[PDB]
């Protein structure tokens, strides 16, 4: 409700530049050996527009 991005990780991330859910974070699979990237294609322009722009309109 203010941040233009969300982290879809299991324990940690690295990248953070998206929308509400259109951001592509990283995930150091809390219970894994490798770190993969999150899907930053979730064009939640509504979540984002309503997240950052929704509050500070």
């Amino acid at each position: 409700g203010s941040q233009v991005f969300e982290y879809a990780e299991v324990d940690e991330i690295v990248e953070k530049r998206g929308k509400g859910k259109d951001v592509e974070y990283l995930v150091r699979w809390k219970d894994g050996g490798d770190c993969e990237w999150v899907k930053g294609v979730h064009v939640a322009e509504d979540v984002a527009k309503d997240y950052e722009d929704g509050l500070e309109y």
Partner: peptide, 14 residues
């Protein structure tokens, strides 16, 4: 479910 990355939530993408 998805081995590797995760999803914040239902993630609304139009």
């Amino acid at each position: 479910a998805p081995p590797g990355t995760a999803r914040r939530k239902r993630k609304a993408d139009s």
